[PDB]
Structure formats: C-alpha cells, structure tokens
A paper describes a structure:
Branched chain TAms (BCATs) catalyse reversible transamination of branched chain amino acids. The subunit of the archaeal BCATs has a PLP type IV fold typical of other BCATs, D-amino acid TAms and (R)-selective ωTAms and consists of two α/β domains, a small domain and a large domain connected by two inter-domain loops. A dimer formation is required for the BCAT catalytic activity, since residues from both subunits in the dimer contribute to the active site.
Residue numbers in the entry:
A (entry chain C), C (entry chain C): 3 to 120, 130 to 291
B (entry chain A), D (entry chain A): 3 to 120, 129 to 292
E (entry chain B), F (entry chain B): 3 to 119, 122 to 291
The structure:
Amino acid sequence: ELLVYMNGEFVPESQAKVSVFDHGFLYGDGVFEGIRAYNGKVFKLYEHIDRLYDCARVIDLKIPLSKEEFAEAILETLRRNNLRDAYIRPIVTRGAGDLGLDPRKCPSPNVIIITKPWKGLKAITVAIRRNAIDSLPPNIKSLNYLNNILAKIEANAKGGDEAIFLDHNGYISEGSGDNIFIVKNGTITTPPTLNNLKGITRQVVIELINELEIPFREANIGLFDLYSADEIFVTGTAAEIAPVTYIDGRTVGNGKPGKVTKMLMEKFRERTENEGVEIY
Amino acid sequence: ELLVYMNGEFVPESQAKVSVFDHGFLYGDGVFEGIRAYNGKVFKLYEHIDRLYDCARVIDLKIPLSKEEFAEAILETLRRNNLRDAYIRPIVTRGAGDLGLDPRKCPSPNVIIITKPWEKGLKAITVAIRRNAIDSLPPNIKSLNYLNNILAKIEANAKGGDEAIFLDHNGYISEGSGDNIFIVKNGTITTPPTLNNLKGITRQVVIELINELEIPFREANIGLFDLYSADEIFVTGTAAEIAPVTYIDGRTVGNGKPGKVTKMLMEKFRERTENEGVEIYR
Amino acid sequence: ELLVYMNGEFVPESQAKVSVFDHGFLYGDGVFEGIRAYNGKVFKLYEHIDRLYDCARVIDLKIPLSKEEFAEAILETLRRNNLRDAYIRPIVTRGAGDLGLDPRKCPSPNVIIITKPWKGLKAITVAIRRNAIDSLPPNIKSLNYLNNILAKIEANAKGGDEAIFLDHNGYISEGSGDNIFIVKNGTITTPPTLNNLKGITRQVVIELINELEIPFREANIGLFDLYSADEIFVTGTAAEIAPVTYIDGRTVGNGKPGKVTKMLMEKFRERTENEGVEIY
Amino acid sequence: ELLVYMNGEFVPESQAKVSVFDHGFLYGDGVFEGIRAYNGKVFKLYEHIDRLYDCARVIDLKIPLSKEEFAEAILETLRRNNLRDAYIRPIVTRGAGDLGLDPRKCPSPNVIIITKPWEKGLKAITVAIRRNAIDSLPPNIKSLNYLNNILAKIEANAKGGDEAIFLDHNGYISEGSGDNIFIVKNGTITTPPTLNNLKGITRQVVIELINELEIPFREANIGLFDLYSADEIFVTGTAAEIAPVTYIDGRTVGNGKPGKVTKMLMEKFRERTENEGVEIYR
Amino acid sequence: ELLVYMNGEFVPESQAKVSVFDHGFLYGDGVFEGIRAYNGKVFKLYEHIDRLYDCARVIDLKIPLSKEEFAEAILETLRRNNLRDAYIRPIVTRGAGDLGLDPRKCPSPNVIIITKPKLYGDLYEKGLKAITVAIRRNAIDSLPPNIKSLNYLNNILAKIEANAKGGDEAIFLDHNGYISEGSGDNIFIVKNGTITTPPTLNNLKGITRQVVIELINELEIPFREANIGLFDLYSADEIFVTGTAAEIAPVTYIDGRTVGNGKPGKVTKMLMEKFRERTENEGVEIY
Amino acid sequence: ELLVYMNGEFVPESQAKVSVFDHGFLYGDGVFEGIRAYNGKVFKLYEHIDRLYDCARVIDLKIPLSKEEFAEAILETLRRNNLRDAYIRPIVTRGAGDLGLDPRKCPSPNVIIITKPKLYGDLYEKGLKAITVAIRRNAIDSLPPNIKSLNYLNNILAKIEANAKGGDEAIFLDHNGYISEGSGDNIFIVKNGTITTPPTLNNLKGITRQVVIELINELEIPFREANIGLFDLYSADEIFVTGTAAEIAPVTYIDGRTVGNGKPGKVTKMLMEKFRERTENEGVEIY
Ligand SMILES: *Cc1c(COP(=O)(O)O)cnc(C)c1O
Ligand SMILES: *Cc1c(COP(=O)(O)O)cnc(C)c1O
Ligand SMILES: *Cc1c(COP(=O)(O)O)cnc(C)c1O
Ligand SMILES: *Cc1c(COP(=O)(O)O)cnc(C)c1O
Ligand SMILES: *Cc1c(COP(=O)(O)O)cnc(C)c1O
Ligand SMILES: *Cc1c(COP(=O)(O)O)cnc(C)c1O
C-alpha cells in the first residue's frame, strides 16, 4: 500500500485523511502542485516548488518548510514508495481554525504529499468563463477548482474530451487543466498567462519552440483564431503535449495530429528523458 | 466530546476526517450550509436544505439522501450532542475518484454534518477584489470554493475592517464576504438583487419583516455613492443575524451607532427566532 | 407553384430572385418578420408590422408602403396562394446603390413577402455571446443573423436541439431564435428584452401568465437559475411554446414537459384559434 | 454590359440575381472579399483568397472550389469583361435550405464574383456604436453581416464625417467602418493589434513598407487620448489605399494636410501596386 | 454689480476670486448645485441642499454650515442682489492644503454662492438635435456620476463632441451600452404612450427628473424606470431631457434621425406646461 | 513672499487668486504639470512641456504661449523667486465663460505657474505601505487617465481610501482587473530579476517612468511592459512607484503582505541611486 506524506509522517493511502475542520476542506483554502517523475528523476522539481510558494504567498499562507525541506520531502516520499515513474500532488492548506473564514485564527498549516504510480482530443468551448483576474486569480493553483470542474462537466455533456475557456473579454484562456497553443501558417501563438496559469509545461514548450526557431507570439486570441488554426494542442504536467484534432466538432487540419505538434511532442519526450532531480 | 455525522455514522470530532482523495478536499468540489438552532428549535431548516439541494444540482451532484432524510440526520446529530443552541454545518462533497478533475469517476458522495454549541456596529471596508462572476463561479452556489471570500477577509483584516464589502465587475455592490447587505436612506430600504451575491435565508426573512412593517423597500442595484450617503447600513446572515454597520471605509454611518430602522428589524427578527422553527426534542 | 410578393408583383418561387447588388444581400442591410396564419386568419398581424417598422427606423430605412398597405400586401399574397395555415416572412432591404456601404446612395428599398404552407428540446449553452446592445442591437430583427447561426452551429455539434445565449454580462439572453422562460417553485421568470428581442409570442405568453395569475418576474438571470429551474421553455412564432427538458445534458424536472409549460401551451393554442385578421 | 460570375456561368449584371431563399440574403450568411486590379495585374490576389477561405472556415462553410480554381475564376471574370483597372467582389454564400437558420439543411453554396471598372485628407468622427465583439460576431470575419459597419457609417453621415472610427467595448480604438487605422506620434507609428478589427491586406503591406523604411513601429492598443494627440492619422484598405485623416472629431490633425510619413508610405505603396501582382492577360 | 457669497462676505463678482491653492481649483475637489428662483420663490431649495450634503458626504467633505444656515445664505444672497428670477450655484470646496492630493492636509473648506439672473425659442415648436457620443459616462466605481462634483471634464468632453458633430445636446451611454443621460440633463423617452427613463445609478438623481415623474404619475401616464439602449432611442415616438437650467427640453432629432415629425411630442408638451405651472405654485419665498 | 506667474504678471502667493467663474474652478476644465528643479537645473523641462501641450490638445484647449515662451516663463518664475531646488506646477485653464459647460463660450485661457521650494526618511530602509483600492481608475473612454487634468477626484477618492485603510499609498486597478498605477505615480514590479510595468494606456505616460526604463535598459536588467494583476503584485520580490514629486519610492508592504523582507529591494535601491545621479547631471540651467 502506497504511503502519503502527512506533516512528516508516512501514512498508508487508505488511512490518509484530513480533519473535516481543515479550511482546506471547508473552504478550498490551500494550494497545490502537479509534478512528474520519469525513470527515477523528478522533472522540474524546483520550478514547481517555486510556483507552490508563490501561490501560497498570493493567498497569504506561510508554508512551514523551507523550499529545500519541501524538495527532500517529495523525494523521501517517492523513495518510501519505491517509485520511479510517478505523479506527485503536493498540497498545503490553511489548517484548522474557528469554523468561520478568518485565516488569522488558523495557526497550523497542513502539508500533504501524494505520489501515485504512472488520434487527438475533441475539444469544446464552454459557456462558463474562466475565473477573473480580479476575483479569483486563475494563476493561483488553489484548491478552488470548481470553475474548472464546471467546464469539465460541460465538455462531458457536449461531446468533448477537453473543455476550452474564454475569459470575460472574449479572449481564449486555456483548457480546464492545461494551457493552449495554436499553429497557423507555421507561426505558433499562445495566450499571455495573465488570464490562465503560468504552466511549467508551457514554459518548456516555449523554450523548445525558440530552439527550433519556429516563429512564435504570446498574444491574445479569439474564436476566429481557434476555428481557422492549422493545428491546436494543449499542455500540462499530466497531459504533456496533447494534440487537439477537433474543436466544437470542426476538424482541425486533416483531423490527425499536426506536423508541428508531433515534432514538439518528440522534443518534449527527450527533455523528460534527460533532465530532473535524482530520487535514488 | 461532540460527535460529527459522517455518512450515517457519529464520529468523535477529533477523529472526524475525510480521505485526502475526496474531491471536496482536492478541488473544493462540494456544497455547504449554515443553520442556527435557538432554544431547541432549528430556524429555517427546510429553506436551508432546499438551498443545499439547489446548489448541489447546479454543480451536478446528487445528494444520496432524500430531503426528508437530510432533515432527520440534522435533527439526530443535534440530539446525539444534546444541543439546544447551536450552529450547524452540513456539507456534501463529490467524494473520491481519479486524482484528476472529472466528476464522472466519483461514484460516491460524502455527507457530513457538524454541530457546534452557540449596542455597537461593525466597521466595514470595501475591497479591491471583486465578487466571483455570475458566468465563472456563480456566487449563488454556497460551495466549498470560498477563497474569493477569504481573499476579501484578508483585505479587511489588513485594512481595519471587521467586514469586507464586495463589488461586482460592473461596479455594483454585491455583499459582505459572508453576509448580504442592506442600506437605509430617507426611510427607504434598498438591497441588491440576489444575482451577483447569494440568496440569503436571513435576507429573505428580513424582507418579510420589512413588508410586515410597511417600510418602503426596493430591490435594486446600488453603488459606492449609495453606501457612502446611506443613513444606515446593515448586513445579514445565519451567524451574524442582523449586524449594524456603523462605519464604512472609516466614514461614520449616521451617528456611529446602530440606526432606528436596523434596531426595529433586529427586535422583530429576534421574535421570529424565538417563535418559529423545527423542534429538536419531539 | 407558390408566388412571392416582390415590390407589388407576384412571382413564382423558383424565379423569385434579388439583384446581387441589393445591400440586403451584400451587407444584410434590411429587416424581417415572421408571422403565422392559423385556419384562415393572421395571428398578431398588426403587432408584427409595427415591430417591422420600428426595426426599419432603427436602421434608418424608410419602408415605401404605409402600414395598411403592408397588411393588404401580406393578405393579398396569402389569398393568391390560397393559404389558410402558413408561415409568412416579410423582408424590407436597403436596395441597390454604389457597391460600398453608404446607405445614402441607395434610393429604392426593396419589399419581399414569402408565404409558405404550414418530449422536449435538449438545449445547450453556447460559448458565443449574443450581439451587444451597443454594437448590433439584438432587438433589431435584421438580416444580420450570423451571431444566431454561429450559435446554432455550436448546438448542432454539441448535442443540442436549441442553442442558449448569454450576454457579455453573463446574463441569460435567449435561444438562437426564441425567447426563454424559466419556472421555479411556481414562479415564472424571463429576462428583460434589452439583451434579446421583444418577442410577440413572449408578449402573448406574459398576458396568459397574468390571466392565470401565476407569479411572474421580468429579471435578469444566470446559469445558476437555468441549472436549478423546475421547468424551462422557449417561445417564438414558429416554435410557439417549446418545452426544454434537458440543459447542457442535465435533466430539467423529470425530463418531460412540465405542468406550467403544458398549461400555457394549451392556452396559447386557444388564442391562436380565436384571434387574427381574416384573410378571406 | 459587364458580366457577373455565378456558379461557373457569366451573367449580364442586370440579370445577376440570387434566390430570395439563399441564406446569404435571408441571414447574411456568407463571406466576401475586396480586391484591386491595377493596369492588368491583380494586387495581392492570393492573400485575399486565403482570407476568404479562412473566413468561410470560421463560419463552417465549405467553398465548392479549390483555391486555385477560385483564382482562375477571378482572373477569367476580369478577362471576360476586358478589365485592367478594376475592383473585384467575390462572395460565397451558404445557399438555400429550409427557411429557418440551420445551415445543415443547405446543400449547395453559391459563388459569385462581381467586377467593376475602377492633397486633402478625410474628416473622421468617432462613433457611439462599438465594434462587433470578438466573442459575439468576430470582426475578423469579412462576412455579409455588415450592419455594424453601416450603423457607424449612418452616424458619420449625420455627424459631419467622411469616415466613422469605431472603439471596442474595452474603449480601445478598433478601426474605420471599412478600413484599418494607424497613427504617427513623434516619429513612431502605432496600429491596433488585429484582434478587435480585421486583418487587413493593405494594413499588412503598409507594415512591410514601414519596416523597409525602418520607421519605429508598434502594434499596440490605443485610446482616444492617442487619436486626439497624434501628429498624423491614416486609414487603410483595398479601395481607399492609404487615406490621410486630417481631422478627427472636428479637431485638426497637424496642419490639416496629409503628414510627412503618410505621404512617404503613399508613394511606396503606389510603387508596389505598379510592380507586383498576378497578370490577367497571360 | 452682483455680489457673490464667499464664506460669509459678499463680494462683487469681478472681485470674487479663490486662491490658486484651493484644491477645488487644483483638483476639482468639491461639489456644486444648480437651483432656480422663479418670481420671488426658490424651487426645491431644501431638496437641492440635501443633495449637496450627500455629494459632500460621498467625497468625505464636511460643509461648515448647517443645512438651515445654507438655506439662509442662499436666500440672503438673492436678497442682496434683489433677484426675483435667477439661477443659483452653491459650491463647496476642500479649500487650500499642501500642494499634493491629500485632503487631510486641508483644514478649511470654502463655501461660495453664485446668483445670476429661460432658453430663447419656442420649445413647443423647435427641439434639440441630440447626438450620441463616443465617450462613455464616468463609471459608477471610478468617479460615480451621482456626485455633482467639480470634476466635469467627462461632461465637457461630450459637449465638445456634440459641438463638432452638429448636436445641440450630447447623449452618453455607459460602459454596458445602456443609455445614461445628456451631458447635463436626465433623459426620458416616450413610446406607444409609455414613458421610460433609466434608473439613476449610471447618471445623476435629478430633481427635475423627480418632479417630472411626480407629474407623470398624477397624469396616470404609464411609466417605467428601466435600462434602455440605442434601439429604444432610435425608435422612440418622443424624447426629452430634464434639468434645472433647461427644464424640460424636447429632443426632436437623434444622430441624424427624425423623432416623430420633428416637432415636440404631445406627451412632452403636456409635461412642459404642467411643470411650468408647478414652478409658479411652489417654492420658498425670498421676500 | 514667493511670486506666482499669472498670465504674464508675477503675483505674491497670498494674492494669487482666480475668478470663481474660471471653468478651471467650476468644472476642473484645464491641464497641469509637475516638474522639479535640482541644484539650479530643471529636469526634463521640454518633455513636461510637450506633455502639457498634448493634454491641452486632448481637451481641445489652445495654450496661448508657444512652447518656447512657456519654457521661458517657467525659468523666469524660478529666477524671480531665487529658487535652486523646487517643484513647479504649470496650470492652463479654459478661463471664464458663461456659467454652463460649453467651452466655445470661453475666449481666454488662464496660464498660471506655481513654484515652491525630498520626502523625509531613509528610503533605502523604510518603504511605503500600499493598499489596493475598491475604486477603479478613470476609464480610457470616459475620462482618459493619460490626461494630466484638473479632474483629480478619482485620485483623491483613492487617497481617501488609503488614508482610512492604513496605507501611505493607494494602488488602482482598472475595469479589466489590470493593475493601473498609484494615485499619483506609475508602478513597477520586480520578480526573479525581471522588471515589469503596465503599458501606459490605463494610467499616465510618466516622465519618471520613462527615465527609469532608460536606466533599466542601460543596466541590462530584463524588462517587460505588460499587463499584470493582483497575483503579480502579491508575489513580487520588489515593488516601487515613480513620479516627479516622489521620485522612486519603494513599496515594502501591499494589502497586509510583506514584500521581500519588508525593506527596499536590491534592484530598487540601485535604480534609486542611478536616478539621483541622473538628476545631478542633466537639466536646463536656470542661471
Ligand atoms: C496545473 C495547471 C496548468 C498547467 O501547469 P503545468 O505547470 O504545465 O502542469 C494549466 N492550467 C490549470 C488550470 C492548471 O491547474
Ligand atoms: C451563507 C452566505 C450568505 C447568507 O446566508 P444566510 O442564508 O442568510 O445564512 C451570504 N453570502 C455568502 C457569501 C454566504 O456564504
Ligand atoms: C423573431 C425572433 C424572436 C421571437 O419573436 P416572436 O415575435 O415571438 O416570433 C426571438 N429571438 C430572435 C433572435 C428572433 O429573431
Ligand atoms: C475589408 C475590410 C478591412 C481592410 O481590408 P483590406 O484587406 O486592406 O482591403 C478593414 N475593415 C473592415 C471592416 C473590412 O471589411
Ligand atoms: C445637475 C445635473 C443633472 C440634473 O439635475 P437637476 O437636479 O434636475 O438640475 C443631470 N445630469 C448631470 C450631469 C448634472 O450635473
Ligand atoms: C503626474 C502623474 C504621474 C507621474 O508622472 P511624472 O511625469 O513621472 O511626474 C503618474 N500618475 C498620475 C495620475 C499623475 O498625475
């Protein structure tokens, strides 16, 4: 049985439980990460940690471990589970307090680390818009994911593998759990991150694009751009690079993964084979 | 030790815990209520349950109890704890599934019920952060995604406020971080339409009291100009009841003491909580 | 073969054609109506005419017939086709001018009248928003219907019989071609018309609701209201009252037409049997 | 008499007519282009066709000609009319179907090609009506729904303007009613990003000329403040080419005469239309 | 020479000047009113004063006079100039401070009251030609339009558009595309015998507007306070605007378009006559 | 007593007054500048003048002085008061007209120049405590924030919030939720060694801001002009604001939250020192 890190103890999965009084559970008042181990090494471990700490700062939550201790803890929980290929979900919550909202009454944050062993998508645009930048900033990878879940429920009902959000301005934002890229006449465009999330996989992809010297723009786009694109793909830690071959039932290109997307998938695979922090 | 209802079992508080795999924890993927018991009667029990079932429907969650069984579970939890004056927090979550978002992989929801035992105004401040928008995370869902509200509270804590007041994206007043808002100006009471806030049970009772008293009343969008020129402000909710707001953004509301109308509504509300409700021990 | 009214001539359907230089065709620069004849009488003929003329005024288009002459023309084209149960599509365009946009160069509007013989809907909310009140006012029943068509294309791809628009504020607007009503705990709500279209069928329905003394509100609503509604229906000249029994795959009530909706359908049917202008 | 291309036939202008059942007429359900021929060569023929096919794809319309065949049809229509200096208007519509909206009932699109034979600035005015929004009726589609643009022109006609200037809902400058917009301020040229307007072929040529001349250039959102303080303004499009704007909202732009930079771009553009294009008679 | 009230002193017009350091001047940091005297009586004097004090409260400015003392000051300045028919402009400013924004550094508000002695033209025959402006009304959460403040550049910019674009009157929309008001007057429309006017939130809670609604309800004309848009303006049977200085002004053309027959409408004309009657029959006696 | 330039005359401060009928006073209808003299030299004098003339053009106001005559007037008013270190406030107003809004009825603008003799405190140690305000910045299509106008009540309202809410400095968002600026200073952030500042569209095209970007590019610090939001502010390593009066001011706390260690950051401190050097080495000689 896999062990979960809970505040420094390793607890079997079936017994890994949090107080119902934890503000993480009552109010989604916490932050989280998603990280992959490939063949014994943790891909972009430090970058993910840095984002976690930034998100914690945004919600005014003090993580009770230094960054190095957090990295050790992630590594120790993979070893304890004897994992080499894994998805890792670190979570930091506000902890318990009074029953109300007030985070000043919550003296002890809680730290959890879950480790689990490890043709394109039909995407649909959803009616629901992404969380606004001045209500629930979407750059926060928080435990408030019901915006994302409502979009997923739409896609499930409407013939889609993946939901695509616009923002309130009508700009394309992202998928429900992944950043979005388009290819047109050989130029790649992706939205600026402000209205979506500063994806680590997106950042790797951009480095690859610039190394391949493929023309690239970070620019807001709309429905006209999605429906006229030669290729679409989405990016994220779990999905990696995933081709999107239909959009609202419309065929993208010939309906199979495009040339630029398949090229980047191969380069991305190479980076995951060659980089990372050693677990053992 | 108080006991927590958990899927039909009564569990000591200290051991009342949920799987870290529950999407309620992972994603705030659930709904909740807040209910008061006053001297052995639950106030507005059925209006709370009905709202819970509406919010669950909006997030496409089937609660695995009939409404009648939910009512019985709440009353039984109160009884097991010997409570007569209490605050009650029902929660329903999506339960566990895959580690990803998709609620279709979540076969079994969790039902939890927490019971706890139970003139100067509030100083309010308006916050920079806007209310969750009606086409992103509709504020009418009393869900476990409460970081909008907590972000507002963090502002109020830093800015000298007991209560944070939200605007929406249009610039319309919305509500407090956990309470609806009313103003009084030249004998007329105005409160925002519920669309950009939440359909409060307390707010509804108060409208009823207003209409009994024949005080002129409007449900209409308002802005900062209205807050800053009001004769009285108050907020409403299950825990706070009716709470006068005596300062706004450091500005004195009337004479800084609770206003004539607010006080009259406070008295009438107290009478309702004394005289109506569902009896726990019967 | 059915005849079409074209500027006072009656022209067989197969030869009923408009100059490609008509600004109606080049730029959708015209207005239109939809009207039903039931058993020899034209339902709300004068109301539809009045709306046509209001829409023409909004686009600064002078209709070259008085209102009475327009009514005569509609009646004459139904008689000429010997119709008793019909859909009528009157259309007024800018006419031809210079090839550019300028309506001042277009001296002669064109008047066309088409007459054709005559479980709920699964509705889906669409990603595209309704035309804005200060860009292309949706109260104009104009020949610019591509907003409406793009929504229809979404619904067709996404498992829907009917598309439902929000506006830019997130408020519910209407269906792609019909007004929307909801029923909850016995109260009926419909949006104010500003962000949709002042439907004649909607107006009849409201009169019926007030005669049945059913609690009613004209109030903006959102997704929360649609997904928690006991009943939904849409209204329009062609559709009449149409029950909506699914919304984004979610069951409305028991998945069959609700009690209040079926009651109004029966009352509406009675009004169409008893009112109208006689054709013969 | 000039002939119009209509689904492969060449029809005298006076008899070139489409079914009143065509959704192009009923609902403006189609796309169009605008193209110039200069001294027996078509300027930017392929960039126009490519845009037509993009706009058709966005409205989910399959044009029943390959791009190469469309190019041949345009050139043949010009030849049949003996034209050398011309304005060309290709149109593709959805064709006829049911009388209702649904494009699935429309089996056969219509292809039409119209050919016509072919220093003081414009007075511009800003209009009240905003540009069609990017998530309602995306302005980048050169569709037959042009009433947004005609409403603007009606304003300009009533308000003393040769050209109407749109803002978008954010308050950003968008474009003219049928032309893109550029400003010049202290030696730098700025033009809006295309998202809230239309990806003009003329605008693209002009950016190329700007970059050849090494004049500092920005693609950036601008507002009224920028228009009202500009040293020069000009608009661009196939019919107008580069048109100086010498007044804005009655305010004089520079000295009221076309500006130094605008004039230099006008000369360079004229050279391109003289020297590049697809030959009609070859 | 007319006298201007200036903090209790009465100063000839030509000498009535304020320090260049008054934040009223530097920053538009103050509030104002517009009130009319008709035939020796001040119309809605106490209502205008109540609004002044609310606007002041909104900008966190304490007016150093009781409401009753302000009413006496207005009446006194009228008497000292011997006026029977007049327009009155009370102004309260923040006063002088440091050069910076901060109102805490400003100890002493200035109170000024200007008093000055109807538009030429047969308003039963000839209305205003209105244009809708590109600029939008100041937003309810940036510079709330309900404040009758010295910040009137939004309003002046709209007037400049109108001046340039062949209008006598500028009409604002708000950011939502809802009709707001004219540059200085609330707006009403009439359609199929029903009168509509926007809620006041996006414009200003006009006292003339309020009087007109009272007259409307007396006449039993169907009435709606609702948001409206361009479609409503362009299809209206009648349009008029309202405010203290101009009273009820018909709008007979909008953005080119003829309203009705291009003359003031029947409803408008009836309201104009009733309003003028109202101004003869009510008011606070100056003498 | 210091003298104030007033349409060519030099008037002692205490006598420097403007008519209550000047539309500058009634309506905030005018434009201004803020310029500093350091050690006998005026810093970016011609740039400030160019901005004044652009703001005037935006509000359709013709300044009745050539740019060169305006430069001489500023220099002259400094010399007449014998200043070496000073803050200069040129103002141009619409002038007097009729009582109404209409700027056509206003024949004669007023030109005023105020000249007055650094914030107390170790700015290498102690920064500003900033709060984000509920009120949004004036919108780009209602009252364009790029205009340095006499309509500063949006800015004063934000300051009032800050005063009440424990801030030294108010920070505005715009209607889109993008960070705009402080109430009177542009804003910069620093994160992982990259500096970001908003495009000027939703705020004001600051001259201090422009100087700072020049210094940044000299230092080869990575730099982005991009929109940003609350997430960016709350996670920034450093924050500072910029403007003529305050120069470069570190912001060490935002809405409760400690920025870095609560002291001015390394990048900020380097820019402050370089900026001060710049102000010693450039400028138009007064004498
Ligand atoms: C985690 C996440 C992403 C992608 O981030 P990576 O760092 O590539 O895994 C994108 N969007 C949302 C909403 C997410 O939660
Ligand atoms: C629960 C709640 C309310 C008010 O609810 P009552 O039903 O009166 O307890 C108001 N606003 C928010 C955000 C809430 O969560
Ligand atoms: C015609 C129309 C309606 C309904 O109008 P009726 O007068 O009931 O037929 C609603 N919405 C749209 C978009 C329409 O075109
Ligand atoms: C066609 C068009 C343009 C400019 O196009 P060119 O391709 O340069 O002819 C600009 N705006 C609108 C609205 C248009 O229809
Ligand atoms: C004063 C004013 C009005 C009209 O108010 P009255 O009280 O009727 O004089 C309307 N709009 C604006 C902007 C105003 O300043
Ligand atoms: C003057 C001003 C600035 C700063 O500009 P500087 O030219 O650097 O003095 C920034 N914001 C506002 C609102 C201002 O008035």
